[PDB]
């Protein structure tokens, strides 16, 4: 019934400290919210969890001392605070809770019994540990060529995501966001593409709608057809 | 060494079916319940199974869990293209208070359509080559199975340096899709009749070819 929505992606140097908010859309005080990230490259592991109603919080071994989770009741909003940060710990982080209901909740079990399989999740916040500088894209129009593919190129950006939209969403059909290649530079680089009708080249308008929010930067670019006798500069 | 062990792949074909195993011990699955988690590439994971084998709204009664002694098992019949997926066992462990998972198990239908990768290529556009660098873009996609091998050439000359090319992903639609780039200086892209991506596929090689004199 509830759902859970978590902070922006984020990024740290190594040693210091990430916090993720995970706020939930109506009261979830009962049962333990848990904590599970996601290495790239890695299975799911388990960080901990805190049953909200009593505070009281269940960590993994490899965590403890660095790990701590709050709830606040008053604002249904759970954290993870993680401390001391390494490379290893460049993963995305999910909270997650249990859609269960009680006829009598109980005021006095073991901490285990309010832990439950996970059928809400949050969408997940994408944490980069680096000593990388932080550095967002540059983005080119791909002008187009019974269908026309046209695009946008998503140049040298760090660290993930990046997110791309078309006219600020009002087109989804024919959108095909590919995977970012992770360049000799260390930086990434993507393309959007739009698979459109060619006849309506003449008229329609297309415009991608960058967002990299690490770097807090957006870019708009409008992608028209390549014009052979008039070559522009600025 | 996940506390509970899973073996780290399965398959199937079309219609067939699986059962993937997920062992532990006493202070674990012994005296606890289990649960199934899927997960897909680029979204949260989702509950399959809970208290060992109950199935949670919605799941299909082709999915199915059991538990007995200190292991446990996902069984999947009717095996579709969307079933490909990490799968994951999980319990509470009394002995470390806590929430334990298995270390997954990939499970990959095969057998699926053979299909030939459709290729765009776009040529640098005029923004960048102002900006003194030149990127060719080659987009892949809608392949299966999902491995290929990208070459660019020059006119008619192979291109090894600059070049960056991702490995294969699994589009929605369950076949894939990969890209290509290759770096130039604008003095090179001008200086060439064309340049070209070609895609190798299952031995069968496509290619696109732009030129800096299109519009």
């Given at each position: 019934?509830?759902?859970?929505?978590?902070?922006?992606?984020?990024?740290?140097?190594?040693?210091?400290?990430?916090?993720?908010?995970c706020?939930?859309?109506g009261?979830?005080?009962?049962?333990?919210?848990?904590?599970?990230?996601?290495?790239?490259?890695?299975?799911?592991?388990?960080m901990?969890?805190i049953?909200?109603?009593?505070?009281?919080?269940?960590?993994?071994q490899?965590?403890?001392?660095?790990?701590?989770?709050?709830?606040d009741?008053?604002?249904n909003?759970?954290?993870?605070?993680?401390?001391?940060?390494?490379?290893?710990?460049?993963?995305?982080?999910?909270?997650?809770?249990?859609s269960?209901?009680?006829?009598?909740?109980?005021?006095?079990?073991?901490?285990?019994?309010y832990?439950?399989?996970?059928?809400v999740?949050?969408?997940?916040?994408?944490?980069?540990?680096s000593?990388a500088?932080?550095?967002?894209p540059?983005?080119?129009?791909?002008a187009?060529?019974?269908t026309?593919?046209?695009?946008?190129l998503?140049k040298?950006?760090?660290?993930?995501?990046?997110?791309?939209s078309?006219?600020?969403?009002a087109?989804?059909?024919?959108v095909?966001?590919?995977?970012?290649?992770?360049?000799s530079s260390?930086?990434?680089?993507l393309?959007?593409?739009?698979?459109?009708?060619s006849?309506?080249?003449?008229?329609?308008?297309?415009?991608?709608?960058?967002?990299?929010?690490?770097?807090?930067?957006?870019?708009?670019?409008?992608?028209?057809?390549?014009?052979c006798?008039?070559?522009?500069?600025? | 060494?996940?506390?509970?062990?899973?073996?780290?792949?399965?398959?199937?074909?079309?219609?067939?079916?699986?059962?993937?195993?997920?062992?532990?011990?006493?202070?674990?699955?012994?005296?606890?319940?289990?649960?199934?988690?899927?997960?897909?590439?680029?979204?949260?994971?989702?509950?399959?199974?809970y208290?060992?084998?109950?199935?949670?709204?919605?799941?299909?009664?082709?999915?199915?869990?059991?538990?007995?002694?200190?292991?446990?098992?996902?069984?999947?019949s009717?095996?579709?293209?969307?079933?490909?997926?990490?799968?994951?066992?999980?319990?509470?462990?009394?002995?470390?208070?806590?929430?334990?998972?298995?270390?997954?198990?990939?499970?990959?239908?095969?057998?699926?359509?053979?299909?030939?990768?459709?290729?765009?290529?776009?040529?640098?556009?005029?923004?960048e080559?102002?900006?003194?660098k030149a990127?060719?873009?080659?987009?892949?996609?809608?392949?299966?199975?999902?491995?290929?091998?990208?070459?660019?050439?020059?006119?008619?000359?192979?291109?090894?340096?600059?070049?960056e090319?991702?490995?294969?992903?699994?589009?929605?639609?369950?076949?894939?899709?990969?890209?290509?780039?290759?770096?130039?200086?604008?003095?090179?892209?001008?200086?060439?009749?064309?340049?070209?991506c070609?895609?190798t596929?299952e031995?069968?090689?496509?290619?696109?070819?732009?030129?800096?004199?299109?519009?």
């Amino acid at each position: 019934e509830v759902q859970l929505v978590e902070s922006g992606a984020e990024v740290k140097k190594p040693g210091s400290s990430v916090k993720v908010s995970c706020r939930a859309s109506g009261t979830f005080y009962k049962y333990a919210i848990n904590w599970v990230r996601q290495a790239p490259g890695q299975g799911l592991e388990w960080m901990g969890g805190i049953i909200p109603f009593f505070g009281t919080t269940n960590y993994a071994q490899k965590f403890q001392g660095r790990l701590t989770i709050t709830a606040d009741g008053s604002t249904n909003t759970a954290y993870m605070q993680l401390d001391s940060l390494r490379s290893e710990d460049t993963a995305v982080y999910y909270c997650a809770g249990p859609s269960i209901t009680e006829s009598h909740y109980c005021l006095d079990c073991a901490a285990k019994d309010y832990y439950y399989g996970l059928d809400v999740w949050g969408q997940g916040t994408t944490v980069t540990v680096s000593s990388a500088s932080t550095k967002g894209p540059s983005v080119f129009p791909l002008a187009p060529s019974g269908t026309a593919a046209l695009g946008c190129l998503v140049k040298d950006y760090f660290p993930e995501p990046v997110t791309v939209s078309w006219n600020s969403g009002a087109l989804t059909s024919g959108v095909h966001t590919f995977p970012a290649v992770l360049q000799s530079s260390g930086l990434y680089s993507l393309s959007s593409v739009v698979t459109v009708p060619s006849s309506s080249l003449g008229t329609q308008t297309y415009i991608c709608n960058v967002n990299h929010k690490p770097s807090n930067t957006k870019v708009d670019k409008k992608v028209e057809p390549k014009s052979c006798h008039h070559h522009h500069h600025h | 060494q996940s506390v509970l062990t899973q073996p780290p792949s399965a398959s199937g074909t079309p219609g067939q079916s699986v059962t993937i195993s997920c062992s532990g011990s006493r202070s674990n699955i012994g005296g606890n319940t289990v649960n199934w988690y899927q997960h897909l590439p680029g979204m949260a994971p989702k509950l399959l199974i809970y208290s060992s084998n109950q199935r949670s709204s919605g799941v299909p009664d082709r999915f199915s869990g059991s538990k007995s002694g200190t292991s446990a098992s996902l069984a999947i019949s009717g095996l579709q293209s969307e079933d490909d997926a990490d799968y994951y066992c999980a319990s509470w462990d009394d002995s470390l208070n806590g929430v334990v998972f298995g270390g997954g198990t990939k499970l990959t239908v095969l057998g699926q359509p053979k299909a030939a990768p459709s290729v765009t290529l776009f040529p640098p556009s005029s923004e960048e080559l102002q900006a003194n660098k030149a990127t060719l873009v080659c987009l892949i996609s809608d392949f299966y199975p999902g491995a290929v091998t990208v070459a660019w050439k020059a006119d008619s000359s192979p291109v090894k340096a600059g070049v960056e090319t991702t490995t294969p992903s699994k589009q929605s639609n369950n076949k894939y899709a990969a890209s290509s780039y290759l770096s130039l200086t604008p003095e090179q892209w001008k200086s060439h009749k064309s340049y070209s991506c070609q895609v190798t596929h299952e031995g069968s090689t496509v290619e696109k070819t732009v030129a800096p004199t299109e519009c």
